[PDB]
Amino acid sequence: LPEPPRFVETQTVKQIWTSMRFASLTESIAVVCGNPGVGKTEAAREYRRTNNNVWMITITPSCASVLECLTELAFELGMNDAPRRKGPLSRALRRRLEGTQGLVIIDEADHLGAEVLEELRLLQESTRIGLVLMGNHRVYSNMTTVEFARLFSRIAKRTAINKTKKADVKAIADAWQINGEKELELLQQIAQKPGALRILNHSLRLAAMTAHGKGERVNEDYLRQAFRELDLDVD
Amino acid sequence: LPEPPRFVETQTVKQIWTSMRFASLTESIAVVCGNPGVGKTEAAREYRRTNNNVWMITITPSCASVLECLTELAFELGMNDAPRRKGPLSRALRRRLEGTQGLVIIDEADHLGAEVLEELRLLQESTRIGLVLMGNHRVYSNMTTVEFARLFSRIAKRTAINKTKKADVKAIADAWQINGEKELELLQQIAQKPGALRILNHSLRLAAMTAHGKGERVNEDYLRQAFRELDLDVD
Amino acid sequence: LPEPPRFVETQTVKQIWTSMRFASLTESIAVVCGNPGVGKTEAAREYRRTNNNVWMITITPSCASVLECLTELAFELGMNDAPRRKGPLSRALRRRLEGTQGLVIIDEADHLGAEVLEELRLLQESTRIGLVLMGNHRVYSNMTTVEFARLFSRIAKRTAINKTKKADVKAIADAWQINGEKELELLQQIAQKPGALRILNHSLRLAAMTAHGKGERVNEDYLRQAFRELDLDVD
Amino acid sequence: LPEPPRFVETQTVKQIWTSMRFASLTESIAVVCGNPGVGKTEAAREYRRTNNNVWMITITPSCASVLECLTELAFELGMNDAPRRKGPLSRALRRRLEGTQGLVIIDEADHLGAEVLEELRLLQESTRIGLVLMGNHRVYSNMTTVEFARLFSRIAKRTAINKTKKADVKAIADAWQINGEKELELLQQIAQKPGALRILNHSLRLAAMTAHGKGERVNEDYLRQAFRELDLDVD
Ligand SMILES: Nc1ncnc2c1ncn2[C@@H]1O[C@H](COP(=O)(O)OP(=O)(O)O)[C@@H](O)[C@H]1O
Ligand SMILES: Nc1ncnc2c1ncn2[C@@H]1O[C@H](COP(=O)(O)OP(=O)(O)O)[C@@H](O)[C@H]1O
Ligand SMILES: Nc1ncnc2c1ncn2[C@@H]1O[C@H](COP(=O)(O)OP(=O)(O)O)[C@@H](O)[C@H]1O
Ligand SMILES: Nc1ncnc2c1ncn2[C@@H]1O[C@H](COP(=O)(O)OP(=O)(O)O)[C@@H](O)[C@H]1O
């Protein structure tokens, strides 16, 4: 019956915002490698929505060149007059982006070319801004250090989020007005399976729409039917 | 609680500024080869901010041609009407840059092509200006002298900065208002590990943000937790 | 303490042998598509060991041509003088294999080329022998019928084995001298997870070697530690 | 003064032999991913020296094809008449190796091609033998499962050895006749640094040769000078 809230502040959200503002004021590189679906991508957008001098792209592996990725960052900076060459684009980024005290956020940092991440790190370095890397744990695996040596020299704050915590789903249940202890344990058990935030949010939205269609309150059995869907135990 | 200082004058900063002004008034070549993250890059920018007729580029290995690097120096000179050919660009640099009594600073001089550094040395020579090389100790290793013979004849003041000194981190503690002798020894021990200035700055900024978030003073335990992060003993 | 038995007769083994002898006497094609690790590959070898005029290859996708696969069947027939051309090999198979009333078994029938399975079906047809296909459920998916039309007309007895049964693991516990009902339920729960026969056999062999190294009987806790290994809930 | 012993039974050696004999009797695949220099390679050779029906290759990335690697295994089987084609070699391995109840050991399993490890797993499977994979933790990273899906279904006993234990270096000190508790703590501290078994063995051999050249007993100061060598804190 109430409106579903899309985003909730969580222990991971608190942690990752402190890491984000750390790389902001620190003006240095923060790598966030974690399990898939730990909710990192969404929080970054909440940081972008709440804070000034913040930018974010995503990297599809289609846009995984230096040219394409810097073009993406340039259009995110609003310079629609960006040149299609590498060089003058790099110069335009260097003139535009330095002195703003900003924070660049990059998602899926595993698909970075060495020249790609190289130009990014030398950019923020030659720009006095923030760069923050996201994605899975292949990002730190791509460094483990003569090709990534000076880059490993400046990793300010890595923060690994493997899975959720109990206060994480507890604040989730607080935001979704969930009071059952059986409900809380079931939410925790759902959080034990991967795609944690995504599956939990899906399960929450299935139960909310089912209880709204039946005119009832979200309860434990709606959550059981929701989790009984999705083919999680079906190969 | 106070504002963090962005830059601190240091014994290396004193040394390297004297080398920088030496190559300036001397109008000759100074190679600064050191360990990675000795803080040389940052000081160069303080020299650029404090002094007139000073320019600086960075060299990504993307921009490692003669054409690209001279284009970078040209846009740093503000000649946005620079030609995309090598020749007329070299002529425009020769007319623009001679007679100003300036100082060109070049970072990461290890990725120089022989024609690249060749055109740079013949430039400053035919320009009555200063050139200063930065980077790791591969720059002097690329010369050790019939291809680099007259260039090794040019060299005015090499200054090797391997690691920090104790007065270095002492002036750091003076700038960061640090009075603990246990704190001073811990800062020195952090300076013994590579990425010296970078890790120390990271550690200083971690402790400052943690003590500001907890409302307290930066103390030894915040420094221990900061250094306990970053995976320095983790492979 | 007793000798571990490598193979046990099972409800799937009974079913699949009846399908195998059916395609034998019927001299027609039987496709066995199932989930991975349903134990089909091993049983086929028990059929090969117990029965005369039985042959079996495996198909690695390295050997997935008509030439390579028929060469494999030829060396399985013991004709080491087989020609390296397609044609005379096909003739040698046609002369050797017809009149023996045999049964060809082919594993991993999903990696069949259309010409590959085409030559196989026209072989057995022009040979008065048996062909039996194995593998996952992509084999029937590759037919779902103008390129596979007459082949879908040959189909004699498909038998899909998705997962195990309770009498399956019951005869497993009879062969492994397992009498605990808690043990039986735990074996069933292990059979609910994929790689059923393989994981169960691994678990049985872990518990047997652990109880033999500790001088004890296989019990429930050894099975729990065995299943606690293998990273089944670890991504 | 006594003879140095090269190999000592250790907790990792006990663990890894139990995993090795497990994959032997189990006739299934055991992946041993660990940190570099955890001493796994040597123990494998002790298993090869002590046990019958055991074979081992190494994989240089020069020999990283299916053809080259199977050729290596064939020459390890003593069939010097092995064919230089893939197919008849695979057939010769299939006829030679099945029925012996053997154990193949493969080192550096990270450099496996998909067809390479594919032919190996289908080999042991079509051979009723043992395969055991070694190397760093990139082997399990290359699987994390539709290209490696049935292979991840094969996996019997992974054993990760990150670093040593205290009983490990304790049995080392027992084999090397080391009784000092200061000596024991120093050996443990050396074991905390990577290249554990190798550096410790190097340190042991430096101290043994120095004390033999000086006519004395190995003591703590010889160990300190040995560890003071090797440039472990020098970049
Ligand atoms: N605080 C939150 N509240 C609700 N859903 C969240 C929250 N944080 C993340 N999510 C969910 O996580 C997903 C977005 O991030 P996600 O895709 O998990 O990132 P990544 O795949 O990079 O780990 C969506 O399902 C989103 O609803
Ligand atoms: N005087 C200084 N005060 C504060 N930080 C400094 C100072 N000198 C260097 N740094 C730090 O060093 C880095 C910039 O130079 P650096 O990257 O170490 O140069 P290089 O890699 O070429 O040796 C940044 O982390 C910067 O904060
Ligand atoms: N009757 C049986 N008794 C014991 N183990 C069996 C039995 N049948 C199959 N297995 C096990 O199953 C595997 C053989 O079949 P498998 O290769 O899994 O078939 P597929 O992967 O083609 O479905 C081996 O692990 C083997 O030990
Ligand atoms: N039991 C042991 N006692 C002494 N040294 C050992 C022992 N086991 C292994 N080593 C040492 O380990 C090395 C051989 O294995 P290693 O190179 O560490 O394997 P990997 O590189 O695959 O981890 C040699 O330095 C060898 O002396």
Swiss-Prot record, chains A, B, C, D:
Induction: Expressed in the early phase of the viral replicative cycle. Expression of early genes is repressed by viral Repc (latency) and favored by viral Ner protein. The keyword 4Fe-4S does not apply. GO terms for molecular function: ATP binding; ATP hydrolysis activity; DNA binding; metal ion binding. The record marks N136 as: Sensor-1. Changing R150A: 12 fold decrease in ATPase activity due to impaired ATP-binding. It catalyses: ATP + H2O = ADP + phosphate + H(+). Keywords: ATP-binding, DNA integration, DNA replication, DNA-binding, Early protein, Host cytoplasm, Hydrolase, Magnesium, Metal-binding, Nucleotide-binding, Transposition, Viral DNA replication. The record marks R85, K86 as: Involved in DNA binding. Its EC number is 3.6.1.-. Changing N136A: 60 fold decrease in ATPase activity due to impaired ATP hydrolysis. No effect on ATP-binding and polymerization. Disulfide bonds: none annotated. The record marks R198 as: Sensor-2. GO terms for cellular component: host cell cytoplasm. Residues 153-235 bind DNA. It comes from the Viruses. It is an enzyme of class 3 (hydrolase). GO terms for biological process: DNA integration; DNA replication; DNA transposition; viral DNA genome replication. It is found in: Host cytoplasm. The N-terminus region contains a putative DNA-binding region that allows filament-filament interactions and probably favors MuB polymerization and filament clustering. The central region contains the ATPase module. The C-terminus comprises four helices arranged in a loosely packed bundle which can bind to dsDNA. Belongs to the AAA ATPase family. This is ATP-dependent target DNA activator B. It comes from Escherichia phage Mu. The lineage of its organism: Viruses, Duplodnaviria, Heunggongvirae, Uroviricota, Caudoviricetes. The chain holds residues 67 to 305 of 312 of the full protein.
